[PDB]
Amino acid sequence: LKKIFIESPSYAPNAFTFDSTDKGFYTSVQDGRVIKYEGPNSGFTDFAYASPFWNKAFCENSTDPEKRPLCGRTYDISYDYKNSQMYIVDGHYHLCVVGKEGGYATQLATSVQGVPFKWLYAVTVDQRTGIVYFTDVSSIHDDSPEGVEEIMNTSDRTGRLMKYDPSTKETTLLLKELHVPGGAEISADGSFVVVAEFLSNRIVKYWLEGPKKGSAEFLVTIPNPGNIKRNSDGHFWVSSSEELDGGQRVVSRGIKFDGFGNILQVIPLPPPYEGEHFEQIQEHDGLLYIGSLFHSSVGILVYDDHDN
Numbered sequence: 478l479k480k481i482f483i484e485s486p487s488y489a490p491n492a493f494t495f496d497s498t499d500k501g502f503y504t505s506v507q508d509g510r511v512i513k514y515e516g517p518n519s520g521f522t523d524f525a526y527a528s529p530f531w532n533k534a535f536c537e538n539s540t541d542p543e544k545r546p547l548c549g550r551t552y553d554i555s556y557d558y559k560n561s562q563m564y565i566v567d568g569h570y571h572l573c574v575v576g577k578e579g580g581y582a583t584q585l586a587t588s589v590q591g592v593p594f595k596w597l598y599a600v601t602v603d604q605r606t607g608i609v610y611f612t613d614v615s616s617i618h619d620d621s622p623e624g625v626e627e628i629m630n631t632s633d634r635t636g637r638l639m640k641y642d643p644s645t646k647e648t649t650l651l652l653k654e655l656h657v658p659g660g661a662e663i664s665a666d667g668s669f670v671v672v673a674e675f676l677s678n679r680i681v682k683y684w685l686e687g688p689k690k691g692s693a694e695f696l697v698t699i700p701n702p703g704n705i706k707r708n709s710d711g712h713f714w715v716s717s718s719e720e721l722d723g724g725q726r727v728v729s730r731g732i733k734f735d736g737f738g739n740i741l742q743v744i745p746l747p748p749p750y751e752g753e754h755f756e757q758i759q760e761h762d763g764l765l766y767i768g769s770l771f772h773s774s775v776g777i778l779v780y781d782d783h784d785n
């Protein structure tokens with residue numbers, strides 16, 4: 478297992494997505510930007526900003542939590558191929574979208590059933606229907622240090638799963654009282670959405686079709702599950718960390734599972750991720766993109782097989 482680091486601006490490149498050109502990638506960073514890597518000999522450019530207030534002088538390269546409400550902080554991004562546009566979920570500006578050329582994003586939704594969003598975290602677009610599925614970590618606590626602390630202390634179970642439909646412009650509540658839903662990924666065939674409940678160490682399966690449509694069921698136990706991203710085979714990669722029996726400390730792993738809950742592949746991450754929580758593992762073009770809040774470079778894994 479080989480690791481590659483790509484030096485990036487700002488800090489904490491946590492989430493990735495890709496467009497039809499498939500040259501490079503997009504990533505969300507701590508200072509409120511969505512940036513685009515253009516290739517090994519042309520670095521990063523700014524792509525988009527959820528916050529309409531974002532500006533270089535005040536927000537570029539900041540990690541001051543006090544500047545977050547103004548600059549924004551995007552937690553996930555999902556490219557819509559049919560419409561050449563990028564969906565965004567931000568901790569301060571909520572569900573947004575930006576067209577192909579980027580720039581400042583258009584805000585789409587900030588509440589459901591009269592209850593404001595507090596910390597949108599994961600997003601995915603159904604490539605066939607253009608319908609957007611996304612999670613809110615809490616209905617009480619935002620991404621401030623004070624908020625994170627309260628979520629932990631009260632074992633906050635006020636997370637939600639929503640859908641947004643661009644043809645109605647309405648958003649609908651699918652699930653409530655989730656236990657820190659930091660990951661959500663639609664099946665290849667659109668029949669279900671898998672949701673990671675970080676504080677309950679599990680993945681649940683929410684049905685979009687079939688006789689159980691509109692309900693969710695337990696799928697598989699995963700320690701401290703984060704983001705979920707589907708690969709081209711239709712399987713799901715999730716970030717995981719497990720406290721080590723005998724240690725102290727965690728062991729970090731990427732875990733690939735199917736829609737029936739079978740564990741298909743387990744990848745212990747190498748340093749520096751090995752003993753740290755991480756955000757996401759996403760398979761694309763034969764590479765594993767690793768999202769984290771704890772580094773200033775993007776991490777990518779590939780296996781070296783030049784001997785067998």
Ligand SMILES: *[C]C1(*)(*)(*)N(*)[C@@](*)(*)[C@](*)(*)C2(*)(*)(*)=C1(*)(*)(*)[N@@](*)(*)C1(*)(*)(*)=[C@@](*)(*)[C@](*)(*)=[C@](*)(*)[C@@](*)(*)=C12(*)(*)*
Pocket residue numbers: 598614624625626628629657658659660675702703
């Ligand atoms: C799951 C992950 N991501 C989302 C959010 C979060 C996580 N974890 C935690 C802890 C505490 C608070 C919040 C959180």
